[model samples]
Every structure is written in structure tokens, then in C-alpha cells.
Target: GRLIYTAGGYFRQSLSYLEAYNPSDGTWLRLADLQVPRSGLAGCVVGGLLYAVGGRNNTDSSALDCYNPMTNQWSPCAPMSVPRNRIGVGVIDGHIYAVGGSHGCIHHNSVERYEPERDEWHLVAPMLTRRIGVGVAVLNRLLYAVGGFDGTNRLNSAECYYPERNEWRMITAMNTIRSGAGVCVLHNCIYAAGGYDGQDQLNSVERYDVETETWTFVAPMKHRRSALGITVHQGRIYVLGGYDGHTFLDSVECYDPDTDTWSEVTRMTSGRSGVGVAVT
Candidate 1:
């Protein structure tokens, strides 16, 4: 019994909303809204609660909101020490790590993790380079921070964090320079899907083989998407709502690695960019 959840994102403007996609019926149900309207926030599930991390918007930028499904309510959590817009965040070992994002989209490499029991965030060793609009995913018990802008250019570089050492080690970079791509793990392989390359919104998708430390192209998504929401359910990878260059997108698509194919799925009621997705 698993469900996919999407938190606040930017449609035309930053949104303060929540929606859950039920796999069995292929339907979506609206949930309580976030206290703050935002886009480019990091959303992750830790200990049965959905945490919406800091993001950029015209309002109070930095915030941490936790959603309790049982009560269907969102409550504020301890906020980050520094403001992180477009931060890459994921839960590992019951702790949530907030990775690189801009200090207001200016690009920063700061890294921090939260201890739920303590309700506090502690700094960790920073990444080798700066990243903003980065994507994060955990595979093989390690966290990987993928493609983002470094202020100089759209980056294709990838880095893996060793929690024990509290350090980040650079890994193989993607073939295409990407900023705001969707990164997730599926069947042990990490997939980096659809992003902006500073020139165009892209539809190309690539997969990283952790064991071989190799990066290869997979079937491209049907639509070009940047600042999208991505999550893996069962054996398929689902990517939803993003900017396709000219306008915001409400389209959703899924990929099947076994067949190296992509299929269209139900679109969201509205378009969203930089939305966060998680399975719980």
C-alpha cells in the first residue's frame, strides 16, 4: 500500500497546496495546504510525516512544514539556519538532509541534516562545488546530489555523500548539462530526467549505473520538462508538472526501464513547476 504525494509548487505563481495520487484508482485527492506559498521547495517523508522544506517565493522564504496524514494537517517544524531556495533534500536513516541550493538563488554549497528527536539541524561538510535547483536521491544507502547551476553554467556533475565521513565525493557527470532536473533511483539505477540546459527545456533522460559508475541515455520523456516533480512507484518512474519553456505544464508521464519505454499518465488539475514528490 503506497501513495505518491506532491507539495507546494509554482504554477503561474508559487502555490500553497498539497495533493496525493492514489495508485490503485489513479486518482488525486487534495490535502491541506502549506502554511507558506512556495516553489522549488524540498519535500521528503520521514517517520510517516511529510516535511516541506525551504523554497523561494515572494513571501517569507525559509520554512519547514510537516504534514501529518492522519490528521490531514500541516504544522511548522524547526526551520533551517540559512535560507535555501531550490534545495535538494532527502531522508536517510530517519534523518532528512538538506543539500545545495542558492542563498536566494545565488548558488551555495552548504549541507545540513535534521535530527527529528532533537528538532534541530546541524551542518555537515559542504559539497565540492556550488549548486542550486539541484536534484537529490538516495541509492545504495548513500545520497546523491545531481545537476544544477553553479552560477557560471548549467552543470552536469554529480556528487555522493558519505554520511560517516560527512563528506561529498564527486562522481561521473551527466552527458547533458542540466539545471533543475528530476533525480530518483529505480531498480538500483539512478535516473536524471528532463531539465533546462540554460538554452532549452529538455526532454532527454539519462540513467546512472552506480556499480559501473556509468551514465547512459534512456528513452526521452514525451514532453520537455524543467523544474519537475519525480518519484518512483513500483517499477515505474513518474515525472509530473514542469515548465516546458513557453508555459507551465500539467502533463505527467512514467517510464518503464525494463522495456525502456515511457507512457502517458493522468495530468494534474493544474500545472506546477519545481514541485516535490515522495512515496509513503
Candidate 2:
């Protein structure tokens, strides 16, 4: 299942619309709208539930909401302690983790975790650098935070969080500095794809090998994209709508790691950037 939240429209208006994509039929089905209009939010699936975290709706938000696919219903969850937008989100051991983001003009190094079982949120170890537009994914039971803007520069630095230790440690940086890139874990490796590198919108992609602790450039995407959505479904990586420096994009593409190649897929119903995506 592929979920997309908010349609990026004129003046960057926030949208509450939500939709789900079915690969079997290659069609999108309209679903329940969010409680509030939002953009630049982070979303992830945990324990058979979907969570939408911090985002912006005219200003930074601390809102957290959950969706039940079985019920096709949406409900509020415990909000984050820190209001933010463009945050990175991941899940491990049934808990959802919210990583670095920005509030108004200030970038943040703060991190937090939500325990659904308790319906509560708690502060956690902060990142070493402040960032927004970051990409996060969980691999091997650890959370990995990837490239983003630090208010001063586009960053290539990466870090990992170990739940057992409750600590964040620096990891090998990406080959390209990127903000708003899409990060996903596939076959035990992390793949970073398409974003702005301070100078240009990018189609370049790279993969981080966990065992070797190194980054390697992979086949680039068909389009330059920033603030896109990415996820691994049925063993292939799907990169969705984003801004290509000029226009809001509706195009979608897929990468097959087995062949090291990319192929165009059906375009989305509407163009969007800064959207929250989840697979359930």
C-alpha cells in the first residue's frame, strides 16, 4: 500500500486530502482526509497502524495523528513535545521516532519517540547537528538519519540511533550533500535518492552499505526531485511526486536493485511536494 498526504498547490496551500495507491490495480483510491491541513510532514507505519507526525500549516506543528486502515478512520495521537516541520520519521521495536526538523526559521537537533502502547511521547537523545528536510529509515533495528539542510549548508553527514543504548553516533556521510532527499532501506542497505544539493535539483542516487560502512553511487532517477516520497514495496523502490526546481511533479518512478536500473511508472493524480508517504 502507498499513502500520499496533501496536494502541493498554489501559494503552497496546505491540503488535508489523503489517498492510497494499489499496485495490483495501479490505481489510487481516495481515503479519509487528515484532521487538519498540513504539509512537510513525516509519516511511517508501525504495528499495523499509520502515523503522521510534525508538519506545517502556516506555522510549525506539534500534531500527531494515527490512521487505522481496517477502519478507514483517523484519530489524534499524543503530539510531539517540539513543534517542527520537514522532520524525519522511522519506526523500530513498535515505537515511532521523530528526528531533526525545523520550527519557523530555526533548525533543530532535537529528537523524540512515541510509544503507541502507552499513547505517549518522550524526549530522546538529540542529533549532533541541526537539520530540516532530513531523510530517515530503520535498518537492522537501528534508525539512520540522512542528509538535509543545517540552516548554513546542505549536509552529507549521516547518523544512526541505537535504541538499546539510547544514543546517536555518526555514520559515513553520503557522496552528495542533499536536502529533501528520499531515503529507504532495501536488501539490508540504505538508498538515498533525488534532492537539492544547494546548487541544483538532483536525479543522482546513492546506496549506503551497512556491513562495509560505505556509500556508492547508483543509477540516477528519471527526474530531478526534492522533497519526494520513497518506500520499498514488493522488493522494488518507488520514488513519488516532488518539486523538480520549477514545477510540482506528478511523475513516479521505480528502481529495481537487482538490475541496477530505473523505469517510469504511472503518474500520480496530482502534483505534490512535501508530502507524507507510508506503506502498510
Candidate 3:
């Protein structure tokens, strides 16, 4: 088990930077460069292949690219039916779902998923509300979309989609409304961590209780930033590079749900935030 990821942090524009796993071992293994430079991108491993999709780069904006560890090279896959950036990503039943993203100064609720075998992206049900930079994760086999920007302001709302029915339904909203917060499923519980809340950045965190349909506060992160790259590794939550106002980050933060603690670790190639991360 290892953590392989990609980052394209730009001060003025995106860069084509890629990195691979120390995995869960805290080492940086650099990898081949991405064919397209992008930011606000998201990805996850599908059928052993890591797919990076939906970014807002000036070039190839609706792109989908897969990293083949088999060949140690990156290959551009089919582009999305629509072009967008700052989208959310998740994998369920082996398919990669690309959620809300914005483009042309418009926020969207449109959704699509990738079928790796066919190398195609097909439209799925759109979210209940329009959102961008949303946090997405799969829980109980359903795809969950959490807090994100809604054009006018940040959101506190959340919802889920059951692919079997190909529909999305509203769920309990977070108590602390925020955008760009990293969300993940851990130990049967859903966790949402540090994000932007319109006026300020947050270290505030929350956990969801499915039975109660509740979201309550958990210990906040040590660093407060939005759109940080987060994922689960060996049951621990690791957060890398984030955006605090306009400052980029390189420090890696780790969270242990079992212990209710947050720790620090990493120094990626450059300052990166609003980046994409996945375990492959």
C-alpha cells in the first residue's frame, strides 16, 4: 500500500509536475511528468490504474489522464464530454466519478464517471445543487459530495448518489459550512477537514454519523487551508499541500482518527495546494 499523487500548483499558471509513493513510508518517489499541466484536478486509482481528471488549466481543460505504474509513464485518456476545472473525484464499484467543477465563470452540478476498460466517460446524475471545488468520497457504496463553492458563497450542504438508481438525493449539511475542505470515509465514518469558509480559512473538522444523519465537530487540523490534498493510508489520514489565502504549501499533515491527533511530515518538489491525491 502506497500513496501516489500529482500536483500542479501555479502562482500565475499551472505546471506539469508529478510524484509517486514513499507510499505510506514517508519518502518522495518522483515520477514521469504529466502530458498536460493542470490545477484544481482530482484523481483515484481505478482497476490498478491512477486516473487524473477535470482540471482548469488554460490547455486541455476537461482532460483525463491515467498513470500506468506498469510502464512508469503517463498516458492521456479520453477527454471529458464537457471541459471544467476544480472538480471533485471518487471511485465506486471500480469506476471513477468526476463531480462538480466550474468553467467560463460558471459553476456546474454536472457529473460524469469513467469506465477504464472502454476508456470512456459517461454522464451520471448531476448533483442536487451546483457546486465547484467540492469534496467527494464514497461511503457505503454511495458517492457523497460535500462542501464547496456555489458561485455566490461557500456551502454547508451535502448530498449522495446511489449508482444502482442513478440518482442523487440531499443529505444532512455540515454544521460548519465550508468550501475546498478535504473529505474522506474512515472506519465507517465520513470526515471533512480544513477548508475555506468564504471569509477565512479553517482548521475546523467534522465527522458524519449515518444513523443519526449528523455532522459534529472533530479536532481541527494543525494547518488551516483550503483544497489540500488528503487521503487514507494504512488507516491514517494524510493531508498534503494546501492553500491559505494565496500562499502555497509543501508541508504534509497526517491525521489519526483512532487517536484524534494530527501530525506533520513531507516536502514535495514545490509549494502546492489545491492539488490531487490518491492511493494506487
Candidate 4:
């Protein structure tokens, strides 16, 4: 119950390693490495299985890999129809969804979904804007896509996808125009944390109220970061490694909503950015 999963990232160069953090003891353990070394990948859990989605090596990749905790094994799944890196991913209703990311020189608005029963990937409704380094989360049974780079500029726009309706609708935008931020749902609210705000790295944090349909500033992280990973464990939001504009970081931090404060936690064994993180 204290286990947190993290996968592929760049540390000098792209890596294929997978690891799990035990918050109870403040230790990290090696698990399985990805089939191909990549960075900027996205990960999410569905029905007890972990899925690693698109990422980049020298170029974009559509490879999809899965991990089973009980069997302690890794297996390949159906690759996305469009290869991408720095994608935003989330799970809704037992299915995994992969959203906008870049493919080398171009950004994308394309979306795809995977069916575990048939182990197949299918195209879904595309987002309103092309993006890379976006943040995604599921709230109230709907998938929400947050700010990201739209090739031409860093975005402040956000949107929601209704699976049953098969359509995307524009939603409240963040105050800060950022890309590569980390997002997670904790206590029924969506939290968006540190990222690059076009001009520089940011330490700002904001939370969206579902009913009010607006965003409000919250306690900011201690560090300015982009391309980080976030996961919720035991009611707290844990932010993992990312680039601080100057150097790769290995530090971890957690946010406590009850106190509305940020506190530094244990550090990772290696400094990295563009990592994939999940809670099991």
C-alpha cells in the first residue's frame, strides 16, 4: 500500500529503468526496465496493470509496454496509431487514454485509447489544440487535459473529454501559461504544479474547483521544475524528479492540503526529468 511506481526518463540520456518507492521506509527498489530506452513517456494504471505509453529516444516511439505486479513481468501491448513523446495519459472506465504529444518536429492533437480485452489501440476524439508536455487527469468520470506547448506558444487553455459523448469541450484555463507541468486528482480536486511558463521555470501551484469551474492559487512547491511526475498516495500528492531549468533534479516533495503546505521528502537515487510516475 506504500508502493509508488516510476518508469523511463532522461538522465544525461534516455533510460529504460523502472523503480518503485517505498514511502514507509524512504527507499527505492529496481523493478523492470523498459524494452527500449526512452524519455518523456506517459504512464497510468487501469484494473491493476501499469501501461507505459509513447516516448522519445532519438525520435518519437509508439511502443506500449505493460507491467503486472503479481506476476512481476513486463509485456508489450498494442502501439499507438500515431507515435509521440511527452504525451498526457489517464485512465477512465477501465480503459487507458493517450493524448497530445510531439513527434519530433511536429506537435499533435490526436488521441488514442486502448482496450485491454482485445489488447488493441483505437483512435479517439482529438483535443482542440495540438500540444506536448501536457498534464492530464480523470475527475468525475471525465478526462481533463491541461496546459501545454502548442508548437507556436505555451498554452493556458484546458479541455475535457467526455468518453460517452465522444467529444471534447473547452474548460476553464489556468492563470499561468505553462507546459510540462504535473497534475493529479486529490480529494476530488485537480491540482496543477510546477512547469515552464514560457519565460522560465515556475514554482506556482493551482487547484481547480469542479463545481465552480475555476482555478485558484495554492501553496507552491519549493522548487521550480518542469517535466516532473506526480502521484497521490495515502491522501498526499508526491511530486518527483524534473528539470529545474539549470540541472536535472532527484529531489521529491509532497503537498498536504489539510495544512496547505509543501514539504521536501526523500530524494531519488538518480537525477532525471521527463519521467513517468504512478501509484499502485
Candidate 5:
């Protein structure tokens, strides 16, 4: 019962849905619109609240907004400590964590969390590496922050944030240093998808097993892409619209946890990169 939306650096800000699908039946539907039309944002569902975090609105930073799925309404929420776009966000232990992104002019290492119960925001330990467009996922109770751009360059270094101690520690670097990777946690493993590797778009996928604390190569996507949005719903992973370097792609693909295989889905209504996706 969740709708998938997409946006990008383009003239029209469009949103679409992956309303219904059976792979066999081939069904789908269109959904509602976002109150604010923008892209390069991150989103996650926390405590029944759907949050649309920082993103570029026209040219720079954007305000944080939360949507109540029950009411189909959006409400203002406490903003980020710094104005930023293209950040990664996830919720752990009930607190929403907003990771690295740029504030119009500069990339940042700063991270923050929002206490929904108190309606307040508090600073967490900054990441060791200053970055934007990082991919973050919580596995084994630790938030694993993956590849991102550190302003001057793309990074392979990854980090972890322990909410209990409110601190961050560097983790093993990714096998291939890249930025704009899609991330998701499924069955205790962290999957890092397509991203940019300096001069080229990437279709490579890597998995980090918390049990071993190491990276492992996995099947690659059919096409190179970056700035895509990913989410795991009903036990399957979905990779949405992203740029293939030269042009935006409306292609949608799914990863089946059961077979470790990917299959193409219905293309999005429009092409986009740096959008957001969340499941209710």
C-alpha cells in the first residue's frame, strides 16, 4: 500500500507509483503528489511517519517535511542542523538519523537525529570522512554509512554509528571507491548498488556481511547507473530511476533475496535520479 516517487534536475518535477504488481499478473496504478516537488532527497518511515529530508529545491537546500500516511497530509518538522541535499537517512531505535550531504556550497560530515517524542533535534558525532550522497543502513544495531563524495573526490571509505554510545567509527572501505550508491539491509547484510566511479557510471553491486565484517562481490546490474533510489519491501529490493551518466533512465529493477537475481520491472512514469523512496 505504498507509492514510489521520483524526481531529478529537470524542468518538470514528477512523481509516480509502483502501485500494484505480481510479476505474473502485470498490474499497476498511479498515486498522489508530494506537497513540495523536489529531488535529491532521502526518505524513511519512522514511527508511522514518512519523512522527506533535505534536497535541492530549484538550486539549493530544502526544508524537512513529514507525511502522515493515514491522513495523506504533510507537516513541518524540525529542520537539519545544516541545509543540505542528496543526503542518506535511516531510522534506528526509533530515532531518525540524517547522514551526509551538501548545504548548497559545501559537503558535510555532520550527522543528526530527531527525537519524535520530544519534537527535538540533537547532534550526533560527526563522521570521520566529510561526505555527501552517502548510503546508510542499519545492520546488527549499528548504522553502516557507505560510499559518498567527500567534496573533492568520491570515497570508498565506510563508517558506522552506534546510537547507544552516540559515536562513529570507521569501517572497512568498499572494494571499489564510489559515490551515489543505493543501500538497503536485508537478512543481516548490507547491499551497495550502482554508483559513480570517478569517470564512469557503475553497475557493480557489493555486499557486506556483518557476521564477517567484510565485503563480497555480487551480481551487477544490466546497465551503469548512479544517484538511484533503493528500498526493500515485502522481502525484495527495488532500484529506481537513476542517471546512466549521459541521460536519466526510467528503468526499474528488482532484486529477489531468495534467488539473488534481478528482474526488470515496469519503468517509472518519468526518468529521475537522486529521488527518495519509503515503504509504509
Candidate 6:
């Protein structure tokens, strides 16, 4: 009935969920709370279970947790091989893949996978560029790791991981180099949206055509943001909170592939960056 997202309150931090707006009726509903209070975590839904992966705790954390709406309970799963904030995650063929992040001063090239069936974790092939603040998604059985920070710089480069081949390969790059963007696959294309370009935040949106290995600029958002969350449901892409350089946002927006346009949805209950979003 409601989509829950966390917020960073002034002076103190907090977590809360609200009815994410539905365009059909434009309504809202309150939902459940996250098991752990966190920010910058990665989220993915598999087998009707919602999994919230690693992010910064009061310190850095590698712990992975999952929630079941049916039970209204949380459970622990395999921890990440390396834990760091602002990294990206994607689920492909029942396995969870984590890519790129920094451990304090150190940037990481490591990638790891979690198998829910076995409740185990294993290392996988790393990305070509060692980075943090990355975005990841799965399309056509392949996982694409999008733009992020590479220690000293932000990156436009993207790569795909083929589980069948057990390797990573370079793919079409973003039109503009960026970090902390929100990415999702809709109608056979991966939509990359809302991030920072070093000097300022961006509302710029772009789409990648996997078959042709090219990118096309699309409608930019109403607000510039970074580290936002993205989810696709009933053929629409919903983008949630992120940092706008000076402030964090709770505004929510959605894009319709058929109309090729974006419209404002219900605002999130919390203004948070790096929160995980998943749809049933």
C-alpha cells in the first residue's frame, strides 16, 4: 500500500516510509520501517523478498539484511566481501552483485556475488575502473555497472558482467561523466539519471541502447540530484531522494517510456541519499 524510504533529519537522522504516489489515483499510504537505520545502502527484490545490502553505519558496514512483507520481519544474509558506502548493486539470475566503493581513503576494484539459495558469498570479476559511488542494473541477463567516482575523478564509462561467461566487458559510455547517478532498465534500454558532475548536481537523464552500444540524451529532471534511488513498476521509472550539492531532497518523480516525459509523483517521507528502492 505504501513505499517506504529513509530520511536524514536535521541535527538528528531518522528512517520512515510513506505511500509512494501512484499516478493512477495520486494517493499515499504509510508502510513498515527498515530493520536497521541506514543510508547509502543497496536494495534488490528477489523471490518476493526485499534485500537491503551494505552501506555506511555510524562507521562502514558490510552486513546484508532482508525483509519480508508477509512476515513483517528482517533476516541476515551473507555479508559483502568488502563493505563501503556509495557503491551500486544489481541482481541477476538469483545472485546479488556488488560493485565499486571506497574504504576510507582506499578505492575498490572488487566485485562480489551473493547466492540466496545457498546463503553464501563469493568474489566475482572486478570492473575495469576502480571506483565508488557507482550505479548498477540488470538487463537481458547481463549486469551493467554505470558511472561513479574513481577516487580522483568521476567516470562516464560503463561495463557489463555476463554470468554465463563469468567475465566483465566494456560497454557504451555515458554522454557526460558523472557519479552517484540513479539507473534502471525499462523497455529494453537502461535509463541513467540524476547525479553530480563535480562542480554541480545534475537532473540530466540518458538512455543506453544495448543492441547498438550507444547513448541518447533524454528529458532532464525538475531538480538536480545525486545518490537518488530508482525503481520500475507497471512500466514507469520512479526516482527518489538524493543530494543536490547543498541540500538533500525528498521529492519523487517518475518517467513514462511511452510519453518520453517525466512528471512529479508524491514526495518521499524522508530526504535521504543512498537509500535502497525495490518494487514487488
TM-score of each: 0.97, 0.95, 0.95, 0.98, 0.91, 0.92
Candidate 1 stretches greater than 4 Å from native: none
Model 4 residue 109 CA deviation (Å) reads 0.5
Task: Give the per-residue Cα lDDT of candidate 4 at 144.
Answer: 93
Candidate 2, lDDT over the whole model: 0.86
Question: What is residue 191's positional error in candidate 2, in angstroms?
Answer: 0.6
Span of ten consecutive residues with least summed lDDT in model 3: 2-11
Ranking by TM-score: 4, 1, 2, 3, 6, 5
lDDT of all predictions: 0.88, 0.86, 0.82, 0.90, 0.77, 0.78
Flag clash pairs in model 2: none
Per-residue lDDT over 1-280 for candidate 5, one digit per residue giving the tens place of the 0 to 100 score: 4554332333245332223223444454433456666677887878877777887775555467777766766788877778778788889888888888898768889988888887677788999888888898988778888999998978999989988897888888889977888989987889999998898999989989876879887888876888888888778788887889887876789888788788887776666777777766
**lDDT of candidate 1 over 1-280, digit per residue (tens):** 5778888899768898799888778899899988778888878888888889888785435578889899999887788878888888977899999988877446778888998888899989999989998989898779999999888888999999999878889999899999989999899988999999989999999999998999999999999999999999898999989999987888889898889999887888798887878888
Error of 1 at 89 (Å): 0.8
Model 5: runs farther than 4 Å from truth?
2-29
| Deviation from native of the Cα of residue 238 in model 6, angstroms | 0.6
1 versus 3: better lDDT goes to:
1
Instruction: Give per-residue CA lDDT, model 2, range 1-280, as digits (tens).
Output: 4443332221267777677777767878787888888888887888878888888885788889998888988999888988879989999888989988998888999999999999998998888888899999899999999999999988999999888998989999998999999998999999999989998899999999988999999999999999988878889988888899998887889899989999987777778788888888
Per-residue lDDT tens digits for candidate 3, residues 225-266, read 888888887788888788877678776778888789988766
Instruction: Tell me the lDDT of candidate 3.
Output: 0.82
Give the residue spans of candidate 4 off by over 4 A. none
The lowest-lDDT stretch of 10 consecutive residues in candidate 1 is 56-65
lDDT score for candidate 4 against the true structure: 0.90
Best by lDDT: 4
Query: For model 3, what is the alpha-carbon lDDT of residue 7?
Result: 53
